[PDB]
Amino acid sequence: DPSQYFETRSRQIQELRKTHEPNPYPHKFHVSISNPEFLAKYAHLKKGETLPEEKVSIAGRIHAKRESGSKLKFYVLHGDGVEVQLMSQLQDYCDPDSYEKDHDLLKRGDIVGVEGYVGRTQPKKGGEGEVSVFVSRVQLLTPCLHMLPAFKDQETRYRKRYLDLIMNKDARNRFITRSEIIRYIRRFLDQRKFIEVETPMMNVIAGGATAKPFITHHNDLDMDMYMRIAPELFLKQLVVGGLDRVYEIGRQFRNEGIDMTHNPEFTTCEFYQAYADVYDLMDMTELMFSEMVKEITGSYIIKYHPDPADPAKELELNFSRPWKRINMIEELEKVFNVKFPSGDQLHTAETGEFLKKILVDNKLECPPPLTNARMLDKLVGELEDTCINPTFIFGHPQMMSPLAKYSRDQPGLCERFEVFVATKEICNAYTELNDPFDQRARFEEQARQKDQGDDEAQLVDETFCNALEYGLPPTGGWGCGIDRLAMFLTDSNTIREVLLFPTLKP
Amino acid sequence: DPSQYFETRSRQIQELRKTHEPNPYPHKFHVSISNPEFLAKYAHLKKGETLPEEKVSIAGRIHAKRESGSKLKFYVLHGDGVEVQLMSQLQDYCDPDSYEKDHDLLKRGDIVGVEGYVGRTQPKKGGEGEVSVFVSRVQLLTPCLHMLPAFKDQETRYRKRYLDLIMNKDARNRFITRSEIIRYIRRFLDQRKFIEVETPMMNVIAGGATAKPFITHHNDLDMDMYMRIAPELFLKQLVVGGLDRVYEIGRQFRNEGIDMTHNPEFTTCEFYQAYADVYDLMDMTELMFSEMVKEITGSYIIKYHPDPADPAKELELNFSRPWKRINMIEELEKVFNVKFPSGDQLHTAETGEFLKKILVDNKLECPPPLTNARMLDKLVGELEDTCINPTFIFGHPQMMSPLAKYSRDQPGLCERFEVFVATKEICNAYTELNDPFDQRARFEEQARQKDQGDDEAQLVDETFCNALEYGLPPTGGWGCGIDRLAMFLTDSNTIREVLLFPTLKP
């Protein structure tokens, strides 16, 4: 029957394309007022009151149609996230000889334009009225050839996102919220005289993060190229150039598997501020995010539901300042009740045995290669799993942070922090390593990590090294995951529901 | 000697990293006031007047250093696009025993922080004074290991953009202007209740334009994918979903050669508005662009210098409304003094012979394949080459516009326009083709164009065709080249000077 409806409506519309008495695909319809403005402009009307002088013209998609008798029909239009009811008595219709022929063509799902006047209906059985258009003329703008469903399934909603947006309206709101998150961040940085810049997405070396890149080829120059995994190395060059405050909100490309917090392409905001350090960035972060949550949510506290198998599970995310701050190695010592190496020894093979002994005793599986950086990163997860409120984890070792500046007092650690919300990492920031001598050392250490099997290690970029030799000022850098911010502010348990068209496993 | 300077400064700084008496790479310096704010706050000072009570602390890069005698030195700092002079008498220096040792370490090009008070110098020979910092303490923040040049060359500036920004400051301004163009467009659309969205950059089918795409591979899913050449087909699906007004400012990827108006990756703004048509878009375009030019330039008229071999050549770009409007085929008939086919016959092989006869008689070389769409596109160039002011070219044929809606009165043409400025195409817009029956026809016609050798033809996307069957309202679509807008508003004769890091021919 769905196939029968599609074939019947197709032949009907196809005939109208030849005959053009209704002209099923007209060019222009003049909308006098949007549906939301319509409902707000005339909400003051009392139940039963009408203004026949107030002529309007609106448009939208038919979501409901009912007809009682032959001289009365009702419609419900969806438009701009608002539902508007139409009432078409025959005494209100201009040209009553066209009344029945104009209506019989309209089916549920069609885009229609309608003219008429304003009034609030008076139900005999339910009361409270409804601001409606008292139809004088109705006109088909675009016919819907398919029968719309009466649709829970998840991964069909991702291939036909447009159908999801038609049927739910719940999806529509969270993508608007995602837009508002991005515009809040731009406002925050623009007001601080940041310059919005754009750096290449196709590079000969993909640096600035630890990830596997996408590869492509430019035919005209017979040149293989990597899709960028981060804009970091370019943005620091701009700061070397004199652009003291830059930021970029764009797409990243990382060749990794899909899960509830990972997409092969995703949006991240990175900003760089000269003459600031981590402690400036820590105050910037919790000022920006706490006040963003209150402005968008209405409260400093969010109720998040992480488990899709148990929607009753409720987490309470308190973004109130000050945020909890913890030192990584200090708390790792408390988690496992053991004194860790000094910190300048965290790269040694003796430390590697120490880390693996903790992993196998606690039955924590670390996928190979078992470099000290990866093994420790797995151990840090035991800290992340109790960070519900936004929590700073500070003091990453140097073997894990090839581009973060060494700590001014703690020997083997870096001035670096990550923020975790509901156990997920939402942003990464540190004091920019502006020391070309130490930078070379970190790049050599990464090269040795790749020698033991870590293909995602960050090897040296000599142009970036040249910029550090000309001089990068003391600056602070910062990067966040926009998609993950959208998850927690829209109460989405998966990243595939804050992405309009998520990467499809075909 | 440049190598000798780099090796000498390296050994010197390397020693300071061990000794740490100066500590060549300190962590944090507290800037009391930015250099531009400094020059504006104290510009009221008269020549010779000082305020020893007003203590400041600023930072920047040394661009000039002079020393007269042993107790007086001058510096000139560059910061935030502003140049500030430092005066360091020994009577002003706190701890005079450190005065000479603190200064001798500083070389031209170093990032330094400086403290002192405010005053305007009084030159005995040149007058007019200069608001200066009367130094009490100077401190090295980042040493510059390389000798800066005394630098015209072009393509070395693209590989070391940071060096370009250090030496010129002329480059710095046009990238700020480019930022202001993007933010003007966002303001224009945001004020009209547009939603800023993001659509995939990695698709299984790259549609929405006529171009050759980049190909890549996702390992986890063993899946080949195309980098997007346009977001159009996704944005129309959002309008089918109920997002009546959407826009996206992001990167496009087209595998084509580099020239003065083409980069393999470039930024384009596309917006889609339901219930509007070309004539709405034409007024939107010349309202947005004319008022953007006046707000950013200060005038409705721009002086553009297109030829790099002849910088004296000056074009006058008048963005005043109304803009000139011309019909494509109507003016092509006047250009060649010949009546063109009816328009519904422009796809036929008889028309193909007609087009080639014009091309070979006028010695216009069209690279194969010689499809009617390509041959006509070459002929249209003869119109483009006299469009100095922003000019609409309206009425493209259907064989050239597979996604533009057919004209309501002109049989074989589409409601489509392109805007040309100084003979270059800056934007492309039309009435969205919301007719799935005719859309299939256009996709079949493109498939036949590919059969005759046009590998860039737009073949069918069946998911997008499904969305049109559910119903796309009558909408108008619009797309512009941000990089090309930046060229004309910054007086840049090549696209590689409005791109921070342009694609490098290695």
Ligand SMILES: NCCCC[C@H](N)C(=O)NS(=O)(=O)OC[C@H]1O[C@@H](n2cnc3c(N)ncnc32)[C@H](O)[C@@H]1O
């Ligand atoms: N100089 C200071 C550091 C700047 C940030 C650094 N360049 C960077 O790339 N950070 S990152 O940790 O690699 O990623 C940034 C954030 O993006 C998010 N992210 C990372 N990978 C993904 C994926 N795959 N999908 C979605 N979001 C992701 C996550 O919240 C991260 O904290």
Ligand SMILES: NCCCC[C@H](N)C(=O)NS(=O)(=O)OC[C@H]1O[C@@H](n2cnc3c(N)ncnc32)[C@H](O)[C@@H]1O
């Ligand atoms: N539905 C209305 C039409 C929307 C626009 C359509 N999707 C589109 O892609 N237009 S385009 O003509 O293919 O490109 C848009 C603009 O981008 C610019 N452009 C195109 N190719 C390049 C390249 N290679 N570099 C820089 N700028 C470029 C140029 O000004 C074009 O007018």
